[model samples]
Target: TAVRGGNVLFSASGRCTVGFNATKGGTYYAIMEGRCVGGARDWYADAARTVHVGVTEAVRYPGDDYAVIRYTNTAVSYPGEIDLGGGRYLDVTGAARPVVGQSVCLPGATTGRHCGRVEAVNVSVNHPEGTVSGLVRTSACTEPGTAAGRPAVSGSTAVGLALGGGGNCASGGTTYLQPVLPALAAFGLTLH
Candidate 1:
């Protein structure tokens, strides 16, 4: 389980971020964006698809925005931590819901890391794919090509799963994220 949260996970033609890792009955799994899961047939660790990663076990897009990836390879080391740049890691000790005006940060392999305050809760967004509801809106504007499924964190707690936000890093914008607890509950997962 070499992959951790915020690492790049690419599919046939597009890419997204690894949100978090969990295990059930001895089988390890990775979580990420439901939108990515909706279109991807398989997952790879490289942009070239040279290193096979895992398979999509479950997806809840349109209504939700989270997906679970089952790690088929036995040798992978997926720790439950955010791989922020500068060699720093934020260990996820638990999951919780975010509140208004709370500060949270999201890490991505392409767009890097951005922090912002929670502006709203239960945000519903309309994407080209479909509408995703119950999102936590933040101001950590990210860009296209940024990996989806990045975890929105406040300290060691996993607050939400980053779907997508408007604007770019330069000017700043809002990001609507799925609450982490719901994603964990829907799939019976625990952070490790």
Candidate 2:
């Protein structure tokens, strides 16, 4: 896939090397893309400290192909969880756990909250929290008409860092933990 918008794709090596493409002679985001193919795929997001590339203590950008990286402490962000059979809820405690396609309410707690129902479940490594973090997605988690996949262990190899928007994925909107739709049915949760 290619970036068509003003957005540009960034490539980098998870481990800081002296002469890697793009990252070699310039400053870059420590975690570049959300996905990286070679080496450990999860080293980027799972890094404890920001590994940035630059010279002279300033993040230098070499035109459009490169730029300094930005990171959000997603580890600290609280996400909604769906209560699965074994005593799990969609991140929120005490809220009614809705099923797939079931209408659920999102707390108007924040500005970015897009009130909607559960879209999908995400089971990704949460080294920051010492466990895999699950997420729920909004209807927009997926493109319209595309079948959503169940949340499962990604093994030791994650998709790695993504270049630009390619790294983007949805997890229950602002909430990343979601319950499997079928799992909900076992509890009388209905999806329409």
Candidate 3:
């Protein structure tokens, strides 16, 4: 299995979107939504969970909502791009701050790639799972499976990780994302 952002990464619990590849010292890690793996350590690149991906090293769910999984599979290749459906991809340059009305696109397993404008910034919300603060709100449509660690990009700059969104792709709704800068800082990770 290949390591790339926007690709489906699975855990013992469920599936998640590959956020981005990162490096810390000599180790390589994949960042994803914290809700994806929960307390599970094992991760996979295939839906059948046969293709090994990595192991969970650190997680900050509920509060910040992102996880760091160390890439233990030496056989897998790590590419610094977001899968944009078919065979197309977008290179992840670096982290960027989200501004209101900024155009962005997010790729997901459920909806593929959906584009919209940033509705708001520094938004707070109370979810059934937990309350998440300091999120960027967007007018993009998203589904349940799609929210698990998908990248929200403004052009080539990495913006945020899909936390969760209200409404459906058909009706359109608000999606909240956990910003990238905090996650990168929290885990001491640099984008690769």
Q: Which prediction has the highest TM-score against the true structure?
A: 3
N/CA/C clash count, model 2: 31
What lDDT is reached at residue 4 by model 3? 85
Candidate 1 vs candidate 3: the TM-score winner is 3
- Candidate 3 has which clashing residue pairs, if any? none
TM-score of each: 0.89, 0.23, 0.90
Using TM-score, rank the candidates from best to worst.
3, 1, 2
User: Using lDDT as the measure, which candidate wins?
Assistant: 3
What is candidate 3's lDDT per residue for 106-192, written digit by digit as tens? 765356437888888888777677877888887775684467688888888888888744676666556778888888888888877
Question: lDDT tens string, model 2, 67-154?
Answer: 1232222342112222122343322222234335644332211224323455544434443313433434443322211111211111
CA lDDT of each prediction against the hidden true structure:
0.78, 0.25, 0.79
Residue range 56-175, candidate 1, lDDT tens digits? 888888788888889887767777787887788888998877789998877652444377778999888788878888888777756744636778888898988777545665565456
For candidate 2, give the lDDT. 0.25
Better of 2 and 3 by lDDT: 3
The TM-score between candidate 2 and the true structure equals 0.23
Tell me which of candidates 2 and 3 scores higher on TM-score. 3
Clashing pairs in 1: 1-76, 1-77, 1-78, 2-77
Q: Is candidate 1 or candidate 3 better by lDDT?
A: 3
Alpha-carbon deviation at 87 in model 3, angstroms: 2.1
The alpha-carbon root-mean-square deviation between model 2 and the true structure, to one decimal in Å, is 17.9
